[PDB]
């Protein structure tokens, strides 16, 4: 009977970097800066 397997409980969450892209989008790798409008605008 498993349960208390060797997950992220006592350890760490990590892969914030696993998070962000899909939170922004990675459609092919094109840096993740915060501010579409201004990229466009210029």
């Known amino acids: 009977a498993i349960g ?3 997950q992220p409980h006592m ?3 990590i892969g ?4 962000l892209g899909d ?3 990675k459609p092919y790798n ?3 800066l915060g501010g579409p ?3 466009d605008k210029y």
Do not use: T
Request: proline fraction near 0%; aromatic fraction near 6%; avoid cysteine.
């Open 4 to 6: 208390n397997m060797e």
């Open 37 to 39: 409008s201004i990229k």
């Open 11 to 13: 350890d760490s969450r």
């Open 30 to 32: 094109s840096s993740g």
């Open 16 to 19: 914030w970097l696993h998070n």
């Open 23 to 25: 939170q922004i989008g």
